[PDB]
């Protein structure tokens, strides 16, 4: 029971710089992109109804 370790994990976490990426669309264009990704594109579907951020 000591306060010596108070920022341990955040302090010892290796620092990774954020990568540069093109800006995300905002407003009506973002909603248009979401609608197109969910209702006009079917190629990602394979019959399993997997999630949009599936990793396996």
């Amino acid at each position: 029971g000591s306060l010596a370790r108070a920022g341990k994990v955040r302090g010892q976490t290796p620092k990774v710089a954020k990568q540069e990426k093109k800006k995300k669309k905002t407003g009506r264009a973002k909603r248009r992109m979401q609608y197109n990704r969910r209702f006009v594109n079917v190629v990602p579907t394979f019959g399993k109804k997997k999630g949009p951020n599936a990793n396996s």
């Binding site: 399993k48 109804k49 999630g51």
Partner: peptide, 30 residues
């Protein structure tokens, strides 16, 4: 990986809720 199998095995484990969600995704929707 078949989510029916994953639910059968891991339903009582730390990932029971996740395998339940994956099973429900596969069961209805296509």
């Amino acid at each position: 990986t078949d989510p029916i199998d994953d639910f059968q095995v891991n339903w009582n484990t730390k990932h029971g809720s996740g395998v339940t969600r994956e099973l429900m995704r596969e069961l209805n929707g296509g």
